[PDB]
């Protein structure tokens, strides 16, 4: 059930996360806070030019194994 995705920080390095398709975008933000300490409310996650809504799941966006998200933090 668990799978791996990449999170590319704009102008930055790539984070690797272990997620499940049922994880919400908010869950992913919490995971990014675990590895990087970035608070979720300063995170925006992007995929293929679209901003991901906090309440939806990776499954809802059809995000699969080894896909790459983008992380904006400010």
């Amino acid at each position: 059930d668990k799978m791996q995705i990449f999170v590319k920080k704009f102008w930055g390095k790539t984070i690797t996360l272990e997620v499940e398709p049922s994880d919400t975008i908010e869950n992913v933000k919490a995971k990014i806070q675990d590895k990087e300490g970035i608070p979720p409310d300063q995170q925006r996650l992007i995929f293929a030019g679209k901003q991901l809504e906090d309440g939806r799941t990776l499954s809802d966006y059809n995000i699969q194994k080894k896909f790459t998200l983008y992380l904006a933090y400010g």
Partner: protein, 149 residues
């Protein structure tokens, strides 16, 4: 635009296989000829921390004609007006079929880091960039916080 489609699919695939650090982009819906793109303000610029959305409309003669790229996010800049239109030579006379959307987006980032006051699409903002960097950086910072964060 089948040959344009094949080249658009290749650029899309290249973005997936080797994600660049300056942009994320992909089709709006099921139409590969219409994309949405996201860039962030270059580091250590007045646009730092902002997320800026752009539209990309490919022509059927692509890659032998440039794509129509416009900002949808509001931005304070002498070469970008309120309609999101960008004054950038590689999008008009200096286009080349060796250019990609990704390379064009990096050039737009370069234009945010160093505006061109000699192509004043917004004369007022261009004058301020020449006259008073402090004021310019303040307004550019404020619009970033207001419209892009």
């Amino acid at each position: 635009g089948a040959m344009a489609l094949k080249r658009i699919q290749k650029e899309l695939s290249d973005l997936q296989r080797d994600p660049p650090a300056h942009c994320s982009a992909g089709p709006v819906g099921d139409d590969l000829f219409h994309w949405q793109a996201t860039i962030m303000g270059p580091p250590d610029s007045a646009y730092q921390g902002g997320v800026f959305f752009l539209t990309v409309h490919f022509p059927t003669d692509y890659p032998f004609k440039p794509p129509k790229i416009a900002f949808t996010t509001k931005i304070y800049h002498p070469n970008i007006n309120s309609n999101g239109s960008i004054c950038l030579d590689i999008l008009r006379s200096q286009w080349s079929p060796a250019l990609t959307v990704s390379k064009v987006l990096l050039s737009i980032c370069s234009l945010l880091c160093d505006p061109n006051p000699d192509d004043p699409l917004v004369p007022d903002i261009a004058q301020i960039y020449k006259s008073d960097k402090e004021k310019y950086n303040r307004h550019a910072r404020e619009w970033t916080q207001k419209y892009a964060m």
